[PDB]
Amino acid sequence: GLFGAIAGFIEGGWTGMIDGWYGYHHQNEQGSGYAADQKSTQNAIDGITNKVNSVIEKMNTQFTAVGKEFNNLERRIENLNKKVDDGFLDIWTYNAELLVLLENERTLDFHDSNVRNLYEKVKSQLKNNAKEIGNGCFEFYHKCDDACMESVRNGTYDYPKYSEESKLNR
Amino acid sequence: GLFGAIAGFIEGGWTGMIDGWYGYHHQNEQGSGYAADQKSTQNAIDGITNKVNSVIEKMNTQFTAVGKEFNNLERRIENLNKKVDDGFLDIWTYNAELLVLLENERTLDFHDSNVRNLYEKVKSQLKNNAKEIGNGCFEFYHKCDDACMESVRNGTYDYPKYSE
Amino acid sequence: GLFGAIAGFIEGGWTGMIDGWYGYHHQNEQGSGYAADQKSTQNAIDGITNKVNSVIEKMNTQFTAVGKEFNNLERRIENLNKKVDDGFLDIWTYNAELLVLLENERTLDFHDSNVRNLYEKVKSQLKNNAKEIGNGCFEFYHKCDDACMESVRNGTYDYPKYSEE
Amino acid sequence: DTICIGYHANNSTDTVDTVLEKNVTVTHSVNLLEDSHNGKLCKLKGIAPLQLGKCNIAGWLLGNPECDLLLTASSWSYIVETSNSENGTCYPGDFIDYEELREQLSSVSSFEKFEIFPKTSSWPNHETTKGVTAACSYAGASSFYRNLLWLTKKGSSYPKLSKSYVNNKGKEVLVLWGVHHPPTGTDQQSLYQNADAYVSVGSSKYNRRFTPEIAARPKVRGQAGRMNYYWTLLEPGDTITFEATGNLIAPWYAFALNRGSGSGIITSDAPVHDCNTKCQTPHGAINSSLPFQNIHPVTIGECPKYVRSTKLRMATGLRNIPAR
Amino acid sequence: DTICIGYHANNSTDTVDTVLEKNVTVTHSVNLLEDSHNGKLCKLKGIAPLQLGKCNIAGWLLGNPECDLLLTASSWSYIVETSNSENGTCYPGDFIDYEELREQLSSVSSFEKFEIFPKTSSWPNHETTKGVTAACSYAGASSFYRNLLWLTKKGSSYPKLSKSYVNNKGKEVLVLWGVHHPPTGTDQQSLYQNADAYVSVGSSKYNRRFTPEIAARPKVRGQAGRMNYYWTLLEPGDTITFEATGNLIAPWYAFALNRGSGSGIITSDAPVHDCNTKCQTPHGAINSSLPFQNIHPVTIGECPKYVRSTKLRMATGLRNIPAR
Amino acid sequence: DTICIGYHANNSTDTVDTVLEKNVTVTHSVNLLEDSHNGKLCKLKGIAPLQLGKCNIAGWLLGNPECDLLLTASSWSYIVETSNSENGTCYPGDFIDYEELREQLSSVSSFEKFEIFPKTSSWPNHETTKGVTAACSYAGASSFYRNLLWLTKKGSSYPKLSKSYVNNKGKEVLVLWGVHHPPTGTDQQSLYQNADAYVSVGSSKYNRRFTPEIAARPKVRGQAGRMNYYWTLLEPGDTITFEATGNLIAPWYAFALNRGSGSGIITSDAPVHDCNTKCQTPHGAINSSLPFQNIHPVTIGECPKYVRSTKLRMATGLRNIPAR
Ligand SMILES: *[C@@H]1O[C@H](CO)[C@@H](O[C@@H]2O[C@H](CO)[C@@H](O)[C@H](O)[C@H]2NC(C)=O)[C@H](O)[C@H]1NC(C)=O
Ligand SMILES: *[C@@H]1O[C@H](CO)[C@@H](O[C@@H]2O[C@H](CO)[C@@H](O)[C@H](O)[C@H]2NC(C)=O)[C@H](O)[C@H]1NC(C)=O
Ligand SMILES: *[C@@H]1O[C@H](CO)[C@@H](O[C@@H]2O[C@H](CO)[C@@H](O)[C@H](O)[C@H]2NC(C)=O)[C@H](O)[C@H]1NC(C)=O
């Protein structure tokens, strides 16, 4: 999208990862599987939860609102009263609909940013020790087992450990 | 630039490419020339067109709106009426001008994002087969002809690689 | 961070750099020290200054606004007049607070984008002549002195290269 | 050996709208627009609404014969008129400041009705019987308002009357009355006997004088005569004095008012049901925590902001792309 | 061999504003603010507006001598008053509920003027001639309204007059009239011949009895007396009865009204032309599909929302950098 | 060797709110909400406000005996009523169109008070002394308004009076008067001596006749009679004529008015001080160039837009991360 990650360089999503919004699918000698990223999924939940609450806060509930009557000699006053009701209605409908459209654009771009940022967090951990394929996948040069995989989706990947990579890298 | 592309790492625009908003240049043994990217130019046109139509949608046209008269003993009511008119006018003027400012910022950043994304789609297509100069240019290693150039501005590149 | 620079791949900021918003730290054989980037700090100051002035422009000051009295047979008009005051007040309180919330989001992202762009301007200047560590740092291969440092934070680097790699 | 980075997806067919694109299916979303009501007029804080039925406020407060069910009314959460509330002013005339009275009633939660000027004791020198009309008929016979007393002359004499009431209650007392306007002078004298009558009503803040407006008019419900209806709010401790030499439709029953906020009058043909709510509308009740609703502008209690919108769905998840 | 990614540019000098930066030349943009009108008052749905000229609403409806051009009027799309519309009430006095009457006319699209009480037929025992005043002079000679009839005593006799009208028009009928208040009792006798007179008016919802207030006041247009003007909307099938022993300015011509929405009263010195539009303003007509305009707050038909803005340009293209 | 890119930080503890996150410590920020006032009622453009004290508008303009400090008043930047402004109408009655009068005074910056009808010169055939009452006492003795004159019969004779005033002031002239309404016909005779009296007031655009409404109302400040107060704005060159055979509370002093915009009436218990401002509220004065204030909705001068917000701080710097 606005950040070329979602529906971009990562063409599609995963109906298979049900633990969260963003995550990994690592494939191993031990096997395959999906795993959601808590750290980044929770910050997205905290922010979106906060966005929705902020919107509701600005829109105060409406209290007792009844109509007024007017006699046949108060048409000007009756029309003034109607103009105000219709006026205030035009404005709150406008604001409500318009605020949603705008924040909907923002929210979708918020997720897009989060995927891009997660991808680039991993990419800068691995560097040489893997090659970027395309669909947001990293092909390892040095072989990462279940335990090693967990250090990548954990922010504790160890580069140096891995010039084995420099061997398979050619 | 919010995405550092337009007026950023691509210093200027081309008066020469007149087919669309985003595109390529390409210098070859067969010759030079410009070519606009249909895919990306179209989506921006569909999106911007939609933004404009949505703005116009929220602003409902004003119907018959005349003024009222009041006698000399109706100054309070006349002032209420006037407070209402001036009031709604302050708000709509505010909403109108303010929506445009904000959306204009979004639109310029939208384009900026569209160029940045196009450049990176190519960069990840070529990889070793080209080096990144500046001004979002790609100097080929494997020397590409007009038929190959069209595979790039196509997303169907192909990879045959040496060096370099 | 919407652009992952601030509080992102550059974990923290420098209480030591007091000249501007964005800048460099060099570290050389001749010594360390901070240095703010005029070009990019000014543009941010121009943009933000203009943003704050633009918000204040849309909020016209309030002139004389007193209240009205009504007799005990004018409750409907008194309530009309009160519905109008409370109504407009509801809307302006909404507009003011809501405009700030939104722009505040944009402003933090604006700075973020600035840091991210400044970083990538240097990255494309150096290329081979340095390796990307973390925290937006560049470890030079060709070893650069205070005089060459100033060419980097200046947009004029110029690539006498020879790869110890 | 590899690891891939990606995002969530599901069978969700929820769609939202953005500025650049419409109908964007997303994984998670919340609806902000309540569009479901109850179809029923419910209680509010346990207290039931007062149904006027085929009566309006005028009929209820004056005591129009067709409104005798309402004679019991004492407390309510809000008031309901229907599309058939046309039994009010049965003797033709103007209800002065009637809309203002309806506004007052909107902040009234209950009252105690009481006989202000008892019919059998208050009028020794005037005739209290006989004060009926075909235009207020009931059970096939001529009748009159229950809360009002049409005084006429005791055989050939209408002595000047003077009756006062002190407000010994703890609250406002709503006093109503009327002045009669015959079509001719002949009539003015067959009823009153003074051809130059006046009605004088005064308290500490009210002072008004009414002279009969004799004129030739069409018949309305069989009557060329007319009746204007009046009301005032008598403050605690204050005194109201009625003075007249003819034409006074005297007060019979008054109302001691209890103020309260959060009430009002609505128009609805919805049925009342034994149920409770915190948000009532002419169409039905609303049980929602949503910020908006498109059901009705008219509201009573604690309700979501009304809005014209048909759809207000805000996105929480991301774009949904199953790509099977 | 190279390939470069780039963006579009052109010679466009259009500038938009952003929150961070003003005057940002862009490649494409639309103007949302219509500021171009017609300088002409045009027809609306084929039907031309009604110019009142030097006359205002009061003059047009009463039949002020200076407004004989409007006697023909029957249908219009809206009503125009100018800066020189001062010919309304030629004989000094109060036009009761005048502002409300204007409001009523704002939703009237046409009417059929008719002789409600024919000047020659309706007043056998009274004097229909001789009812003119220097304050309503025309052609240099004393005259009076064309729609009202100033009745006077027929040879030192002014018998009680009674005259009813039944509305069999299927529409509302607007009935205007007046009550005259002489400066001296001497004038009262010489006009009516009864020293103590009265006017009475009564319909199904109207009922009043006017009594001449005889006093000396500053001469206005040479007249120390006053004349008060009254109106009422007589509903279908209803009857209006007039009775008087003097001081009645009788209704001569009345108006059978036709209701319609979208009409109004504006003030404009712009010329009416054989032109047609869907949006009219006091400055001129507007032909536009834009969402906004800064021409005028007052609007008739379908118009863009008014706004104080001087400029509302929304960018569609990208920042324009030719970099030649 | 190395070179690192980074951002600024400091010891700032300023926080702002965003839609995604609250309390985000930033490096730089500006406050947009003014919440500091002066606690004082200052002058506007050098000119001091008019403090009414225990008096209200009615007491000031009529000249209630407890408002003698206000006789001197002539110019003001704005008008102030306090929580103890109850001394106004001392003789019980209605001040007709009082709220409308208040609205008029809101656009008045100054006036020249004058003796429109000199007490000792204007009434040769009427009694100008003796027009006092215990309901308007002062210094333990019965007194009366300073700007009005209570005319009474001169020894069993109350001749028809006629008094005119031509407005040669080039300004509007505010004229106040009253019509007295005794409790009994005996009181009517002892005061006026004509049983059937009348008061008549007329200008170029004003015309009204008053007759005594005699009846007994509850005593207010000891009085069972009522006095109704009236005003009118006499236009330049225009003439007002008073005519009466009793019950006239004649004008004594009137006011030539000077219009001006930006003035008004406020309710405040804050003390006036030798001080100058451009923005005044009932709480106190404001010296700010901020766009918003949450101090008070009522304003006089040039002020920041009022808003319910507690906090409006707009971020200018970036997210603050010292990371020591
Ligand atoms: C109560 O209301 C009913 C219906 O609104 C009145 O009935 C109408 O009376 C008029 C006049 O007699 C008739 O022309 C209509 O045909 C009647 N309509 C119906 C539906 O019956 C009734 O007279 C009112 N009664 C009282 C006492 O107010
Ligand atoms: C029609 O309007 C004109 C303009 O107001 C009237 O002319 C004025 O008449 C008064 C009274 O005689 C004069 O004092 C003014 O000098 C006149 N003004 C102008 C501009 O000429 C005219 O009398 C009105 N005629 C009718 C029948 O209403
Ligand atoms: C001015 O106002 C004061 C207070 O409103 C009046 O004094 C009150 O008068 C009432 C009625 O007589 C008494 O019951 C109260 O006890 C008095 N209160 C106080 C605090 O004195 C005073 O009479 C008024 N004077 C004038 C001339 O209007």
Q: What count of other Cβ atoms lies within 10 Å of the Cβ of residue E92?
A: 20
CA distance B57 to D309: 13
- F216 contacts D243? CB cut-off 8 A: yes
F16 contacts F314 by C-beta, under 8 angstroms? yes
CA distance F54 to F57: 10
Pocket flag, ligand 1, residue D90 (CB < 6 Å): yes
What are phi and psi for residue F58, nearest 5 degrees?
-60, -45
Nearest partner of A51 among A10, A103, A119, judged by Cα: A103
Give yes or no for A97 touching B (CB within 8 A). Answer: yes
E151 contacts E161 by C-beta, under 8 angstroms? yes
E303 contacts B61 by C-beta, under 8 angstroms? yes
Q: Which ligand is closest to the CA of D136, given by its number? A: 1
List residues bridging with F29 in a β-sheet.
F315
Q: What count of other Cβ atoms lies within 10 Å of the Cβ of residue C80?
A: 20
CA distance D37 to F49: 55
For chain F, where are the alpha helices, taking DSSP H only?
Answer: 57-62, 98-105, 185-191
CA distance A11 to A19: 20
Measuring CA to CA, how many Å separate E120 from each of C68, E124, E127, E246?
A: 54, 8, 10, 19
CA distance D212 to D226: 10
CA distance E312 to F170: 46
Q: What part of F 182-211 touches B (C-beta under 8 Å)?
A: 205
The residue whose CB lies within 8 Å of the most ligand 3 atoms, and thus the one to mutate among F221, F223, F227, is F221
- Closest ligand 3 atom to residue F138 Cα is 27
Interface test with A, best of E98, E101, E103 (most A CBs within 10 A): E103
Cα-Cα-Cα-Cα dihedral sign, residues B43, B45, B50, B55:
positive
Give yes or no for F93 touching D (CB within 8 A). Answer: yes
Cβ-proximal residues to A135 (8 Å cutoff; 6+ apart), any chain: A9, A10, A11, D4
Nearest partner of D154 among D246, D217, D284, judged by Cα: D246
Q: What count of other Cβ atoms lies within 10 Å of the Cβ of residue E157?
A: 12
CA distance E229 to E206: 15
By alpha-carbon position, which residue is closest to atom 6 of ligand 3?
F87
CA distance D322 to D183: 84
Kindly state whether residues F211 and F256 are assigned to the same domain.
yes
Pocket flag, ligand 3, residue F65 (CB < 6 Å): yes
DSSP F112-156: EEE-SS-TTTS-TTSB-SS--EEEEEETTEEE--SSEEE-B-SSS
3-state SS assignment for residue F93? coil
Measuring CA to CA, how many Å separate C108 from each of C111, D61, F20, F28?
A: 5, 63, 12, 11
Side-chain-facing half-sphere of F255: CA atoms under 13 Å: 26
How far does residue E90's CA lie from ligand 2's centre (Å)? 9
Q: Which chain F residues are Cβ-neighbours of C39 within 8 angstroms? A: none
Q: Which residues of B touch F (CB under 8 A)?
A: 72-76, 79
Q: What count of other Cβ atoms lies within 10 Å of the Cβ of residue F323?
A: 11
B104 contacts C106 by C-beta, under 8 angstroms? no
CA distance B141 to D64: 101
Q: What count of other Cβ atoms lies within 10 Å of the Cβ of residue E227?
A: 24
| Cis upstream peptide for B164 (omega within 30°) | yes
Residue with tokens 């991993």: A122
Q: Which chain A residues are Cβ-neighbours of C135 within 8 angstroms? A: none
Q: Locate D87 and state its tokens.
A: 């039994």
Kindly state whether residues F159 and F118 are assigned to the same domain.
yes
- F94 contacts D162? CB cut-off 8 A: no
- Domain hosting B24: range is 1-164
Nearest partner of F61 among F83, F41, F87, F94, judged by Cα: F87
Pocket flag, ligand 1, residue D136 (CB < 6 Å): yes
Residue of chain B nearest D309, judged by CA positions: B58
How far does residue E273's CA lie from ligand 2's centre (Å)? 28
- D22 contacts B51? CB cut-off 8 A: no
Q: Which chain E residues are Cβ-neighbours of F203 within 8 angstroms? A: 217-218
Q: Which residues of A touch E (CB under 8 A)?
A: 72-76, 79
Structural element, H or E, at residue F262: none
How far does residue C24's CA lie from ligand 3's centre (Å)? 78
F236 contacts F172 by C-beta, under 8 angstroms? yes
Q: Locate C36 and state its tokens.
A: 């703010």
CA distance B154 to B30: 19
Q: Locate E284 and state its tokens.
A: 């001129």
D285 contacts D279 by C-beta, under 8 angstroms? yes
Structural element, H or E, at residue F31: strand F29-31
Residue of chain E nearest C55, judged by CA positions: E19
Measuring CA to CA, how many Å separate F186 from each of E59, E158, F157, F180, F199?
A: 49, 38, 15, 14, 19
Q: Which ligand is closest to the CA of D138, given by its number? A: 1
3-state SS assignment for residue D153? strand
D26 contacts D7 by C-beta, under 8 angstroms? no
D8 contacts A17 by C-beta, under 8 angstroms? yes
β-pairing, F265-267 vs F33-34, is unpaired
Q: Is A79 exposed, middle or buried (0-12, 13-18, 19+ CB in 10 A)?
A: middle
CA distance B112 to E24: 14
Q: Which chain A residues are Cβ-neighbours of B77 within 8 angstroms? A: 76-77, 80
Q: Locate D320 and state its tokens.
A: 């949904």
Query: Which DSSP symbol is given to F317?
Result: S
E57 contacts E106 by C-beta, under 8 angstroms? no
Q: Locate F97 and state its tokens.
A: 């169109």
3-state SS string over C149-163?
HHHHCCCCCCCCCCC
β-pairing, F141-143 vs F133-138, is antiparallel
- A103 contacts F19? CB cut-off 8 A: yes
Measuring CA to CA, how many Å separate E263 from each of A85, B65, D154, E106, E302?
A: 21, 9, 58, 6, 12
Cα-Cα-Cα-Cα dihedral sign, residues A17, A22, A27, A28:
negative
Q: Which chain A residues are Cβ-neighbours of F19 within 8 angstroms? A: 50-51, 54-55, 103, 106
B86 contacts B78 by C-beta, under 8 angstroms? no
Nearest partner of C67 among F257, F34, F281, B86, judged by Cα: F281
CA distance E27 to C151: 35
Structural element, H or E, at residue C15: none
Q: How many domains does chain B have?
A: 1
Q: What's the gap between Cα E214 and its chain centre? A: 32
Task: Please state at what angle helix A75-126 crosses helix B38-58, rounded to 10 degrees.
Answer: 150
Residue E53 region by backbone torsions, left for phi larger than 0, else alpha for psi between -120 and 50, else beta: left
Kindly state whether residues F324 and F236 are assigned to the same domain.
no
- C135 contacts F98? CB cut-off 8 A: no
Q: Locate E78 and state its tokens.
A: 């809206």
Q: What's the gap between Cα D117 and its chain centre? A: 24
Query: Which DSSP symbol is given to A161?
Result: G
CATH number where C86 lies: 3.90.20.10
Nearest partner of D293 among A59, A83, A107, judged by Cα: A59
Q: Which chain D residues are Cβ-neighbours of B47 within 8 angstroms? A: 20-21
Give yes or no for E74 touching D (CB within 8 A). Answer: no
E298 contacts B66 by C-beta, under 8 angstroms? yes
CA distance D235 to C129: 93
CA distance F76 to F110: 6
Pocket flag, ligand 1, residue D223 (CB < 6 Å): no
Q: Which chain E residues are Cβ-neighbours of D214 within 8 angstroms? A: 200, 209
Query: Which DSSP symbol is given to D54?
Result: T
Kindly state whether residues F69 and F135 are assigned to the same domain.
yes
CA angle (D136 as vertex; D132, D139 as ends), nearest 5 = 95
Task: Tell me the resolution in Å.
Answer: 2.8
Q: Provide the residue type at F157 as one letter.
A: S
Pocket flag, ligand 2, residue E66 (CB < 6 Å): yes
Q: How many domains does chain E have?
A: 2
F235 contacts F167 by C-beta, under 8 angstroms? yes
How far does residue D98's CA lie from ligand 1's centre (Å)? 21
CA distance E74 to E77: 11
3-state SS string over chain E?
CEEEEEEECCCCCCEECCCCCCCEEECCEEECEECCCCCCEEEECCECCEECCCECHHHHHHCCHHHHHHCCCCECCCEEECCCCCECCCCCCCECCHHHHHHHHCCEEEEEEEECCCCCCCCCCCECCCCCEEEEEECCEEECCCCEEECECCCCCCCCEEEEEECCCCCCEEEEEEEEECCCHHHHHHHCCCCCCCEEEECCCCEEEECCCCCCCCCECCECCEEEEEEEEECCCCEEEEEECCCEEEECEEEEEEECCCCCEEECCCCEEEEEECEECCCCECCCCCCEECCCCCEEECECEECCCCCCEEECCCECCCCC
CA distance D188 to D197: 9
Q: Provide the residue type at B77 as one letter.
A: I
CA distance D16 to D313: 6
Q: Locate F141 and state its tokens.
A: 């003795």
Longest dimension (CA), chain C: 95
By alpha-carbon position, which residue is closest to atom 13 of ligand 3?
F221
Interface test with D, best of F95, F181, F217 (most D CBs within 10 A): F217
Side-chain-facing half-sphere of C119: CA atoms under 13 Å: 25
Interface test with A, best of C83, C95, C108, C138 (most A CBs within 10 A): C83
Query: Which DSSP symbol is given to D273?
Result: E
Structural element, H or E, at residue B101: helix B75-126
The residue whose CB lies within 8 Å of the most ligand 1 atoms, and thus the one to mutate among D83, D87, D95, D133, is D87
CA distance C64 to C66: 6
3-state SS string over C60-129?
CCECCECCCCCCCCCHHHHHHHHHHHHHHHHHHHHHHHHHHHHHHHHHHHHHHHHHHHHHHHHHHHHHHH
F284 contacts F270 by C-beta, under 8 angstroms? yes
CA distance D300 to D309: 20
β-pairing, F15-16 vs E226-234, is unpaired
CA angle (A117 as vertex; A116, A122 as ends), nearest 5 = 100
Task: Please state at what angle helix C38-58 crosses helix C75-126, rounded to 10 degrees.
Answer: 170
How far does residue F182's CA lie from ligand 3's centre (Å)? 22
Give yes or no for F99 touching A (CB within 8 A). Answer: no
How far does residue C138's CA lie from ligand 3's centre (Å)? 86
Residue of chain A nearest C134, judged by CA positions: A124
For A11-140, where are the alpha helices, taking DSSP H only?
Answer: 38-58, 75-126
Q: Provide the residue type at D112 as one letter.
A: E
Pocket flag, ligand 2, residue E219 (CB < 6 Å): no
Buried b (16+ CB within 10 A) or exposed e, A4-43: bbbbbbbebbbbebeebbbbbbbbbeeeeebbbbeebbee
Nearest partner of D229 among D187, D174, D310, D164, judged by Cα: D174
F212 contacts F296 by C-beta, under 8 angstroms? no
By alpha-carbon position, which residue is closest to atom 27 of ligand 2?
E136
Query: Which DSSP symbol is given to C142?
Result: S
Residue F254 region by backbone torsions, left for phi larger than 0, else alpha for psi between -120 and 50, else beta: beta
Q: Provide the residue type at B142 as one letter.
A: H
Buried b (16+ CB within 10 A) or exposed e, D153-192: bbeeebeebebebebebebbbbbbbbbbbbbeeebbbebb
Measuring CA to CA, how many Å separate F67 from each of A153, A154, F176, F226, F231?
A: 83, 82, 17, 22, 19
Give yes or no for B84 touching C (CB within 8 A). Answer: yes
CA distance E71 to F90: 55
Kindly state whether residues E203 and E301 are assigned to the same domain.
no
Query: Which DSSP symbol is given to D317?
Result: S
Torsion of CA E136, E140, E142, E145, to 10 degrees: -40
Nearest partner of D151 among D164, D141, D160, judged by Cα: D160
Give yes or no for F16 touching C (CB within 8 A). Answer: yes
Q: Which chain B residues are Cβ-neighbours of F233 within 8 angstroms? A: 72
Q: Which chain B residues are Cβ-neighbours of C94 within 8 angstroms? A: none
- Domain hosting E12: range is 1-41+274-324
CA distance D320 to D27: 5
Give yes or no for E202 touching D (CB within 8 A). Answer: yes
B122/chain E closest Cα distance in angstroms? 9
Q: Locate D199 and state its tokens.
A: 């009605």
Q: Is B123 exposed, middle or buried (0-12, 13-18, 19+ CB in 10 A)?
A: middle
3-state SS string over D194-262?
CCCCCEEEECCCCEEEECCCCCCCCCECCECCEEEEEEEEECCCCEEEEEECCCEEEECEEEEEEECCC
3-state SS assignment for residue B13? coil
Buried b (16+ CB within 10 A) or exposed e, D49-66: bbbbbbbbbbbbbbbbbb
C11/chain A closest Cα distance in angstroms? 12
